[PDB]
Design a protein around this ligand. Sequence first.
Ligand SMILES: CC(C)CCC[C@@H](C)[C@H]1CC[C@H]2[C@@H]3CC=C4C[C@@H](O)CC[C@]4(C)[C@H]3CC[C@]12C
Ligand SMILES: CC(C)CCC[C@@H](C)[C@H]1CC[C@H]2[C@@H]3CC=C4C[C@@H](O)CC[C@]4(C)[C@H]3CC[C@]12C
Ligand SMILES: CC(C)CCC[C@@H](C)[C@H]1CC[C@H]2[C@@H]3CC=C4C[C@@H](O)CC[C@]4(C)[C@H]3CC[C@]12C
Ligand SMILES: CCCCC#Cc1nc(N)c2nc(-c3cccs3)n([C@@H]3OC[C@@H](O)[C@H]3O)c2n1
Ligand SMILES: CCCCCCCC/C=C\CCCCCCCC(=O)OC[C@H](O)CO
Ligand SMILES: CCCCCCCC/C=C\CCCCCCCC(=O)OC[C@H](O)CO
Ligand SMILES: CCCCCCCC/C=C\CCCCCCCC(=O)OC[C@H](O)CO
Ligand SMILES: CCCCCCCC/C=C\CCCCCCCC(=O)OC[C@H](O)CO
Ligand SMILES: CCCCCCCC/C=C\CCCCCCCC(=O)O
Ligand SMILES: CCCCCCCC/C=C\CCCCCCCC(=O)O
Ligand SMILES: CCCCCCCC/C=C\CCCCCCCC(=O)O
Ligand SMILES: CCCCCCCC/C=C\CCCCCCCC(=O)O
Ligand code: NA
Length: 396
Amino acid sequence: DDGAPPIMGSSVYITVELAIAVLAILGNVLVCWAVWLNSNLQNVTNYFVVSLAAADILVGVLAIPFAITISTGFCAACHGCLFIACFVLVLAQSSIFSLLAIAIDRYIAIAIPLRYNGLVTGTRAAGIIAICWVLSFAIGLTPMLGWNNCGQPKEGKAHSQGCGEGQVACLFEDVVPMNYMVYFNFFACVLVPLLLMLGVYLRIFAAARRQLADLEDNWETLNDNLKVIEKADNAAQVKDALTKMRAAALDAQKSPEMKDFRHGFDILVGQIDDALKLANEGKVKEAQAAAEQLKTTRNAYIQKYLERARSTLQKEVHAAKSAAIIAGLFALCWLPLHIINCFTFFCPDCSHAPLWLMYLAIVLAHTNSVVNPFIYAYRIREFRQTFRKIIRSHVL
Ligand SMILES: CC(C)CCC[C@@H](C)[C@H]1CC[C@H]2[C@@H]3CC=C4C[C@@H](O)CC[C@]4(C)[C@H]3CC[C@]12C
Ligand SMILES: CC(C)CCC[C@@H](C)[C@H]1CC[C@H]2[C@@H]3CC=C4C[C@@H](O)CC[C@]4(C)[C@H]3CC[C@]12C
Ligand SMILES: CC(C)CCC[C@@H](C)[C@H]1CC[C@H]2[C@@H]3CC=C4C[C@@H](O)CC[C@]4(C)[C@H]3CC[C@]12C
Ligand SMILES: CCCCC#Cc1nc(N)c2nc(-c3cccs3)n([C@@H]3OC[C@@H](O)[C@H]3O)c2n1
Ligand SMILES: CCCCCCCC/C=C\CCCCCCCC(=O)OC[C@H](O)CO
Ligand SMILES: CCCCCCCC/C=C\CCCCCCCC(=O)OC[C@H](O)CO
Ligand SMILES: CCCCCCCC/C=C\CCCCCCCC(=O)OC[C@H](O)CO
Ligand SMILES: CCCCCCCC/C=C\CCCCCCCC(=O)OC[C@H](O)CO
Ligand SMILES: CCCCCCCC/C=C\CCCCCCCC(=O)O
Ligand SMILES: CCCCCCCC/C=C\CCCCCCCC(=O)O
Ligand SMILES: CCCCCCCC/C=C\CCCCCCCC(=O)O
Ligand SMILES: CCCCCCCC/C=C\CCCCCCCC(=O)O
Ligand code: NA
């Protein structure tokens, strides 16, 4: 006994865990309360947010008390010890599924918006959420099915602590096999899905980049070909430019504001047709004058359509970044503990990470259950405004 009494360091760890638990419950209860109250927040994307918040509420209510209990090494039946050690794996896996669903949902919205509402529905989302929770319990509790160290209990540690028959000193790394934690949980169930999310978000931002560039190209094609018509010398040159503009207009043609965008393209294709007939009749001056009327349609309809399409794309990029930040923070908070397990497993010649670092890595992982409500409040106005209403009306 040359080191400080364990209860002193335990007290700091336990106090910090309890602080994290309270904060995890408060913030994520607020998220669930906001979606339940505000119909503007009731969409498929946010149903996975609620599932994610539910997992974080359970981290504070169950996983953290379990972790505190594990840190004492109390005597326990091995499979009972195994359950409280593995339950957080269930919650982490649920978080992964929810995060992956959110990325996929945002990809469907950007890649095929015209058939998003018919493909992604609330009833289908609720069923997916239920399946993912079942799979999370199956994956997280796999050690309960026999992939555990309960067959080889550390009897020396058990006897030294005065444990009874069939009991062990309940310690995470004594009951949960490290090949499970590294190969099965980390590589297969955590790292691979996180890498898939990375690929999905790369496809989301690439798709958004491509669609914003295409919009700016059509706007340039319309204006360039208008100049070609104005400076044309014969009717054939006017026809060639008008033939291009017509195909582009019909290509760009694929609520009150929407009622005026449909009326705008009807004027545009009609005005292109009028000029195209004049050009085919060899009336070059009549065609140019008719083409000049397109500027009026451009100023009153086409330019406004371009700006709303651009605004909508930029809002999707902003939302996709918010979702990517959530997934990235999950990786940042959990990777240290995973990396420590890799050193324990792959470097038997390395000294085990010290107890204080284990505490720090565990606290960091649990802090992930606190951060999501802040991301929503800082990056999503509808959440921010709803949070204020709830706070001003019920807390204050
Ligand atoms: C739905 C929620 C509220 C129910 C919570 C039930 C939890 C707390 C229960 C369910 C199973 C229980 C465990 C089952 C078996 C054992 C083995 C025993 O030697 C020590 C206690 C221990 C480890 C129990 C601790 C408490 C426990 C984890
Ligand atoms: C960006 C984030 C996710 C990376 C964090 C990496 C952390 C977890 C890495 C960086 C350096 C690593 C340490 C480097 C050296 C040792 C000494 C060895 O005897 C036990 C493991 C231990 C103590 C490692 C534990 C994990 C460690 C602390
Ligand atoms: C893309 C990133 C975030 C994925 C994480 C990569 C992980 C798996 C990498 C990063 C650092 C790596 C460790 C670096 C050093 C050692 C010490 C060596 O004696 C055994 C392997 C071990 C323990 C490596 C295992 C794998 C490792 C933990
Ligand atoms: C020594 C500190 C107190 C006793 C302990 C431990 C301990 N040792 C580990 N090697 C470990 N690895 C994990 C992982 C679960 C999912 C991914 S990594 N955990 C659990 O993850 C956060 C907490 O819930 C904790 O119980 C771990 N706990
Ligand atoms: C957003 C990412 C997370 C941001 C938040 C930072 C993450 C850490 C959390 C709280 C401070 C850490 C408190 C440290 C408590 C663990 C150390 C401990 O228990 O001390 C052991 C003792 O000193 C000898 O055993
Ligand atoms: C949401 C409302 C708040 C409810 C939550 C607040 C009430 C719980 C308070 C304290 C629990 C303290 C946990 C006791 C665990 C002590 C373990 C200990 O000290 O022993 C360590 C071991 O013996 C050597 O490593
Ligand atoms: C809001 C409250 C609603 C919450 C919903 C509650 C529904 C729980 C249903 C079944 C739990 C079955 C118990 C599972 C935990 C026990 C694990 C177990 O039995 O293993 C320990 C073993 O006995 C060691 O010897
Ligand atoms: C939406 C809610 C979803 C929840 C749906 C639940 C799905 C559970 C599926 C697989 C886990 C089964 C793991 C096996 C549990 C075994 C516990 C047990 O009894 O083993 C200890 C033994 O009794 C002492 O030797
Ligand atoms: C014992 C297995 C059966 C358990 C029943 C399922 C568990 C229920 C868990 C949480 C209930 C909250 C579900 C979300 C409510 C949303 C309300 C709505 O759809 O409008
Ligand atoms: C509202 C949901 C409430 C859930 C309660 C969870 C809090 C309890 C957490 C862990 C239980 C600790 C079990 C410790 C067993 C010690 C018995 C012994 O000394 O052998
Ligand atoms: C909603 C909160 C859920 C209830 C949690 C209550 C807070 C208790 C926190 C940790 C419990 C730890 C109990 C000690 C484990 C057994 C240690 C021993 O046997 O010596
Ligand atoms: C011991 C208690 C530990 C508390 C952990 C810290 C909690 C802070 C929560 C979230 C931090 C991130 C909030 C800022 C996100 C801004 C989003 C953005 O604008 O890009
Ligand atoms: Na989580």
